[PDB]
Amino acid sequence: SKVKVMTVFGVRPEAIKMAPLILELQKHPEHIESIVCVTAMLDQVLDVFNIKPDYDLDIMTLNDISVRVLQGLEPVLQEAKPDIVLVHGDTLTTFLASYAAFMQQIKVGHVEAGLRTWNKLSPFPEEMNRQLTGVLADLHFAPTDWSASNLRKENKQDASIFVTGNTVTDVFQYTVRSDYKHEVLDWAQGKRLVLMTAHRRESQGEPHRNIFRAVRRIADEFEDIAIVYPVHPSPAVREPAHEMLGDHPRIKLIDPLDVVDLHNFYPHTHLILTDSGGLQEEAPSFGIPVLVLRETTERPEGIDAGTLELVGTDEEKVYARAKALLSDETTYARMSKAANPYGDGKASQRIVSAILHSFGVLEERPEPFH
Amino acid sequence: SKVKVMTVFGVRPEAIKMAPLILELQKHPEHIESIVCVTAQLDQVLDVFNIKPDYDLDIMQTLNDISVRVLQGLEPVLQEAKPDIVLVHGDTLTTFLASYAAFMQQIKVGHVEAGLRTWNKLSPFPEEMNRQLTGVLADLHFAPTDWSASNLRKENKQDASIFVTGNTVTDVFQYTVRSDYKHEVLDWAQGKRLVLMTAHRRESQGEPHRNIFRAVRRIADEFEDIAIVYPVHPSPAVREPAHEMLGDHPRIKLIDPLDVVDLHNFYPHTHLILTDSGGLQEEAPSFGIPVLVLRETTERPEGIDAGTLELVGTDEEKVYARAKALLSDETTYARMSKAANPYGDGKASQRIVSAILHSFGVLEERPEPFH
């Protein structure tokens, strides 16, 4: 008999962040039996990573989902009798699965533990979901030292916290290929590829107008850049973007990129302007400095590490900081050299070691991630 | 148009501690509409206090079954009654579920008796995990004591959300104690210092009980002005060694366990207590009665910290010696009797209602905390 590890998730983002961990668990058949339970059509990502769910609950109101996840999971847990349920992040499923496991005295491991706004109403219900999971979790896999210190602020036992980095950083192995080809990359071939995204609804109109004027000026000023802008579908973005950026030789407006396309652009790209939490988390793995089109951010670790800079939404600031990053090779090499404080691409390895250690199979505590 | 407060309780003890708070809520009809929701897996308690449940889920059982049933039951009740705040008590599963049901409808949560911690999810199970889960859903924490509030601050709860109110257990004596009260055993004890002893914990049932019974016997032989009342655990593993070792002594009356209302009515007549009851330890010091605790430790420091309780263990000599001391020298009796019950002053319900009124902006000034 083995450590029976059941991973439970049920949305597209959760699936991608859990896939590399599941693949890591399957590398230890000596010590671990890897069970996968989906709550939920997440089989699209599961076909990429070639993950076969052993259970598929179907939950096609917050109270209704809660009841239905609890009902579905009870028989799954008393049949499989896992030693540890692993949940990810801050979905309703993360909390409900931890709670189903708590009610059968099954150990809980929380992947991406410790993220806090300390505001119940923002985000809702994710802040409450991650605080509830926080009280049910036996093992906290904190991506960062800031995450781990959130957990210490709540009086969690130090020995229960493992800073592992984020598994987001483990997916590039499965996703990035050399074979990879795109018309947009061919169009950008000889130039510094500048990747920009603005999907935040609250920046439509005046803020977008300001960003676009700064970007146009930058396109005009630099003859050795090619700006790729995967534009938000909304007419409230498409129109102003086409109107103000649509007929420039060094700006390609395109349809939003798939995750796999996005990951494959990263090796080719020089600078990012985004308001995406995802690009801010991933891009530094490839040396890409990120200028963040926001007044603030929820996560401090990127700022403090210098992988990201807040640049806001006003024209002068966006232009100036974009200019500075594209000429001043000192600031670029600085942001580019700083290592992704969000992970190594070895988080799944550390989480599996932490599970093995907690069950007495590994006598040594793995080295954290700093 | 008022602050609609729905109070939720599930078990006999939960109902008794919530009863005084409901009766206090009913005293503010200008500001508060009081609603009562029962979620039981009780009709005596609810009659003693004259409380009419407005709602009632007749719950049929794993923790998961209860969990699904309470959630299913409460969604209709909260959708209809549309309360502004849900009040929940202690560390029951139902307290958490009711808090969770409320959270999903963005309904405010008030937690009565918040902040009790062992920081061990395995003792008690599932109560420690239940009160931590409730702790993350509560908007208002009604901490019985400063120690309880300190636990909540250790968990990074915001200071303005914590109110130290005292415990509503000290609010129930007004409703249960009558001057008109009579009892055979009270008459038997008349003219004497009544020593009330209980021994309920299964952990001590054997040679610890024999050690205690021996100490009690030597105290019964020694003291002429003493009457020992022992409402014995009805289990033959206790009732037999008790009736064997103490049942002959004319200064000891072994009787059946007391109703809560009877126990409360003994308190004004009792000089001294020996117990392992967490209940007597919370209650008796409201009547200035010193308690010798028949345990090596207790979960809860506030009693020991105040001089209301002394840990005395189960070893014959120390039970004897500490019992003898409390019966012999005032100055020791006096230190313990005079110290204010750190668990409450009978006004907790009043402080909880003020906290609620203040949180809804009806009372502009933050009310003053218990001691």
A14, A24, A33, A112: the active-site residue: A112
Given this structure, which CATH class describes domain B3-167+345-359? alpha beta
**Binary contact (A155, B119; C-beta < 8 A):** yes
Tokens for B172, please give them. 């129930």
- A128 shares contact with chain B (CB less than 8 Å): yes
Domain ranges of chain B: 3-167+345-359, 181-338
- B129 shares contact with chain A (CB less than 8 Å): yes
**Binary contact (A103, B62; C-beta < 8 A):** yes
The residue among B57, B155, B159 with the most chain A CBs within 10 A of its CB, best to mutate, is B155
Helix (H, G, I), strand (E, B) or coil at A251: strand
In contact, A343 and A169? CB cutoff 8 Å? yes
All residues of chain A having their beta carbon less than 8 Å from the beta carbon of residue B63 are 103
Q: How far apart are the first and last CA of chain A?
A: 34
The residue among A124, A154, A157, A158 with the most chain B CBs within 10 A of its CB, best to mutate, is A154
B141 is catalytic: no
Bridge-based pairing of strands A3-9 and A84-88 is parallel
Closest CA to B276 of B336, B319, B219: B319
Q: What's the CA gap between A263 and A276, in Å, rounded?
A: 14
B14, B24, B33, B113: the active-site residue: B113
Burial class (CB in 10 A: 0-12, 13-18, 19+), B70: buried
What residues are paired with A3 via a beta bridge?
A: A32
- A62 shares contact with chain B (CB less than 8 Å): yes
**Count of CB atoms within 10 A of residue A183's CB?**
9
Q: How distant is the Cα of B159 from the closest Cα of chain A, in angstroms? A: 13
- B321 shares contact with chain A (CB less than 8 Å): no
Interrupted backbone of chain A, residues before each interruption (C–N > 2.5 Å): 40, 60
- A78 shares contact with chain B (CB less than 8 Å): no
Q: What's the CA gap between B332 and B330, in Å, rounded?
A: 5
**Count of CB atoms within 10 A of residue B192's CB?**
15
Q: What's the CA gap between B284 and B309, in Å, rounded?
A: 10
Closest residue, chain A, to B104 (C-alpha): A62
Q: What's the CA gap between A48 and A67, in Å, rounded?
A: 31
Closest residue, chain B, to A67 (C-alpha): B68
> What is the topology classification, in CATH, of domain B181-338?
Rossmann fold (3.40.50)
Q: How distant is the Cα of B132 from the closest Cα of chain A, in angstroms? A: 7
Helix (H, G, I), strand (E, B) or coil at A351: helix
Q: What's the CA gap between B281 and A116, in Å, rounded?
A: 39
Q: What is the resolution of this structure in A?
A: 2.2
- B154 shares contact with chain A (CB less than 8 Å): yes
**Binary contact (B72, A71; C-beta < 8 A):** no
In contact, B25 and B353? CB cutoff 8 Å? yes
The 3-state secondary structure of B297-354 reads: CCCCCHHHHCCCEEECCCCHHHHHHHHHHHHHCCCHHHHHHHCCCCCCCCCHHHHHHH
Question: H or E stretch including B238?
Answer: helix B236-246
Query: Radius of gyration over alpha carbons of chain B, in Å?
Result: 22
- B101 shares contact with chain A (CB less than 8 Å): yes
Given this structure, which CATH class describes domain A181-337? alpha beta
Q: How distant is the Cα of B270 from the closest Cα of chain A, in angstroms? A: 42
Tokens for B60, please give them. 């049929």
The residue among B156, B157, B159, B161 with the most chain A CBs within 10 A of its CB, best to mutate, is B156
- B100 shares contact with chain A (CB less than 8 Å): yes
B34-50 CB burial, b ≥16 within 10 A, e <16? bbbbbbbebeebbebbe
**Superfamily for domain range A3-166+344-358:** Glycogen Phosphorylase B; (3.40.50.2000)
A362: DSSP letter: S
A179, A183, A201, A367: the active-site residue: A201
- A61 shares contact with chain B (CB less than 8 Å): yes
B14 is catalytic: no
- Give CA A3 to chain center in angstroms: 27
A126 is catalytic: yes
**Whether the domain at B3-167+345-359 and the domain at B181-338 fall into the same CATH topology:** yes
Place of tokens 């003859």: A223
Q: What's the CA gap between A92 and A98, in Å, rounded?
A: 10
A26: DSSP letter: T
B202 is catalytic: yes
A221: DSSP letter: H
The residue among A95, A98, A103 with the most chain B CBs within 10 A of its CB, best to mutate, is A103
**Binary contact (A71, B71; C-beta < 8 A):** no
- A333 shares contact with chain B (CB less than 8 Å): no
B127 is catalytic: yes
Closest residue, chain B, to A99 (C-alpha): B64
Q: How distant is the Cα of A67 from the closest Cα of chain B, in angstroms? A: 6
Instruction: Give the strand order in the sheet containing A290-292.
Output: A251-254, A225-230, A192-196, A269-274, A290-292, A308-310
Pick from A62, A103, A157: CB nearest B64: A103
Question: In this complex, how many residue pairs, one in chain A and one in chain B, have their CB atoms less than 8 Å apart?
Answer: 60
A90 is catalytic: yes
